[PDB]
């Protein structure tokens, strides 16, 4: 049957969907690894062992143990990033849409999720793989790896809960794709490792870490950086917040053999009930655990691999979106709601930059204060929320992201970037919010297609617009077909495009004014003082 499968770990049997008109085979929630549950909490992973008989590959697996959004219930605008199968400590699973009739060897690309290392899903639906495996012809594998705690917590010395262990996940699953994707049609060659936020950091990570470059071709990255400020810690600092962790469940911080086997006691919501506790600082898009800079997975500081080449160097696609912003004022910021149009006080204003830049002295807020003040109406509330939105925005995403870029391309093979402003027409979350961080997603995963979930005419234009760049890409290591084109990003130059509904234009320097502030100008204050 063409849903019978042969692998290196076992004989696999799929199951066949539908897809627009078509159909196509769905292989649901394959194990890569051997269940980190028990005690093997918190430790490296290990290979699935090899199975006798025929695994069934049909319904989704489950979801790891993670934290679940309850801030607006019933809520679909925020409904849509929750777990939305059963969770379990038990969730290395991963899952492939190939296309029917079954290619011989065709373009991999392997999903990673976002979720700010503390939470998501491989089976939401906004990461359904049938319409990109069908429209575009394409092997579409989704992985899934540990979050919180169960994932990142970090207690260096010792081998029992060394850190980077969800990274490890991730590459364990890169490794089986290796190993195995050319029985279902995919050709290894050629697989492109491609992620949102949280998502984006790992493929960039994966980009520097040594034992993961040799398992992948190409890498796309959305909205996500290895060096985004949120995205990695100290390992003093990893060390700091598990044992801050040990605390508020009343663990013996006396040896560290002690508080891990403390923490593998208690049972999964536990951890995750007080997760956010640990975090040193009152913040905003900051994260309990995190890529810990240990050393082995990181060979050096980030900075440094950076400055001198030491990364794969292959080509890549990567962007920002419009307002990545205004998801994480909402949540966390006073004067924003969901149902106002959060006018913003020059009161809640300082407040906000002062959460979002919880490492600066005052000096270093009144640097940022000034830079995205309107001094000659220096009370608008729009313009505040608004000017807000931009520091969350810039100084989170856009321009520790752009730093990567300008590193990336001296040494890189080519580097294509895009600038996604498309609001979408059916979008649930307030105006005011614009283009929000999470919101290209659909697009690239072609919903738009789909007639019942109502997008415009041109909005199903944008997304198999996307999705050829994207595939295309991935098989080519360029977005355009031979033979009006996305240009490459250079150094001299830095043309990027907009990605929405009418005919593209090609720009410069994006953000540039204030990346230089981000980027050069605020870290040598910070210094000084
Ligand atoms: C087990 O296999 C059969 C069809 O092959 C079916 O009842 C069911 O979809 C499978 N159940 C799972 C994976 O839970
Ligand atoms: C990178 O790729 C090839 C193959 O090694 C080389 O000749 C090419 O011109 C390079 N291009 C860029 C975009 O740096
Ligand atoms: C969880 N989430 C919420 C808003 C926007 C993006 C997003 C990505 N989660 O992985």
């Not at 799929?14 to 292989?27: E, M």
């Not at 290895?226 to 810690?233: G, H, I, T």
């Not at 929320?385 to 890189?412: A, E, Q, S, W």
């Given at each position: 049957?063409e849903l019978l499968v042969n692998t290196k770990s076992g004989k696999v049997m799929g199951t066949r969907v539908p897809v627009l008109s078509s159909h196509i085979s ?163 060659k050629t697989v492109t490792i491609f992620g949102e936020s949280a998502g984006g950091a790992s493929v960039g990570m994966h980009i520097l870490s040594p034992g993961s470059?040799?398992?992948?071709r190409r890498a796309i990255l959305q909205s996500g950086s290895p060096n985004c400020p949120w995205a990695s810690v100290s390992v003093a600092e990893g060390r700091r ?289």
């Amino acid at each position: 049957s063409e849903l019978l499968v042969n692998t290196k770990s076992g004989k696999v049997m799929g199951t066949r969907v539908p897809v627009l008109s078509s159909h196509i085979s769905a292989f649901l929630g394959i194990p890569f690894a051997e269940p980190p549950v028990g005690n093997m909490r918190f430790r490296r992973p290990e290979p699935k062992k090899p199975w006798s008989g025929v695994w069934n590959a049909s319904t989704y697996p489950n979801n790891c143990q993670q934290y679940v959004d309850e801030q607006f219930p019933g809520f679909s605008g925020s409904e849509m990033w929750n777990p939305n199968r059963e969770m379990s400590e038990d969730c290395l699973y991963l899952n492939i849409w190939v296309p029917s009739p079954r290619p011989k060897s065709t373009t991999v690309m392997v999903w990673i999720y976002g979720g700010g290392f503390y939470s998501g899903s491989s089976t939401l639906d906004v990461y359904n793989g049938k319409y990109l495996a069908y429209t575009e012809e394409v092997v579409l594998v989704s992985l899934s790896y540990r979050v919180g705690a169960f994932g990142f917590l970090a207690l260096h010395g010792s081998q029992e809960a060394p850190g980077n262990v969800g990274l490890l996940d991730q590459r364990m699953a890169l490794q089986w794709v290796h190993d195995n994707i050319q029985f279902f049609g995919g050709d290894p060659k050629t697989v492109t490792i491609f992620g949102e936020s949280a998502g984006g950091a790992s493929v960039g990570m994966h980009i520097l870490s040594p034992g993961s470059r040799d398992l992948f071709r190409r890498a796309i990255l959305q909205s996500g950086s290895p060096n985004c400020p949120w995205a990695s810690v100290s390992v003093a600092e990893g060390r700091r917040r598990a044992v801050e962790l040990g605390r508020n469940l009343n663990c013996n911080l006396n040896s560290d053999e002690e508080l891990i086997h403390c923490l593998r006691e208690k049972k999964p919501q536990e951890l995750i009930d007080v997760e956010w506790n640990v975090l040193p600082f009152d913040s905003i898009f900051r994260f309990s655990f995190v890529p810990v800079i240990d050393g082995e997975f990181f060979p050096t500081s980030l900075e440094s691999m950076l400055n001198s080449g030491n990364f794969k160097k292959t080509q890549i696609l990567l962007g920002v979106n419009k307002d990545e912003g205004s998801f994480f004022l909402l949540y966390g910021a006073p004067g924003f709601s969901k149902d106002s149009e959060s006018k913003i006080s020059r009161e809640d204003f300082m407040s906000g930059v002062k959460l979002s830049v919880p490492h600066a002295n005052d000096l270093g807020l009144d640097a940022v204060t000034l830079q995205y003040t309107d001094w000659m109406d220096d009370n608008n509330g729009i313009k505040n929320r608004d000017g807000l939105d931009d520091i969350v925005g810039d100084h989170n995403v856009i321009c520790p992201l752009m730093h990567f870029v300008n590193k990336y391309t001296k040494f890189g093979n080519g580097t294509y970037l895009y600038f996604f402003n498309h609001r979408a027409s059916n979008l649930v979350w307030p105006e005011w919010m614009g283009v929000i961080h999470g919101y290209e997603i659909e697009f690239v995963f072609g919903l738009p297609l789909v007639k019942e979930l109502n997008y415009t005419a041109e909005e199903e234009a944008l997304s198999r617009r996307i999705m050829h760049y994207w595939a295309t890409f991935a098989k080519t290591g360029n977005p355009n077909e031979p033979h009006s084109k996305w240009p490459l990003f250079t150094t001299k130059e830095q043309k990027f495009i907009d990605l929405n509904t009418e005919p593209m234009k090609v720009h410069q320097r994006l953000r540039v004014q204030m990346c230089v502030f981000w980027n050069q100008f605020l870290p040598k204050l910070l210094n000084a003082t």
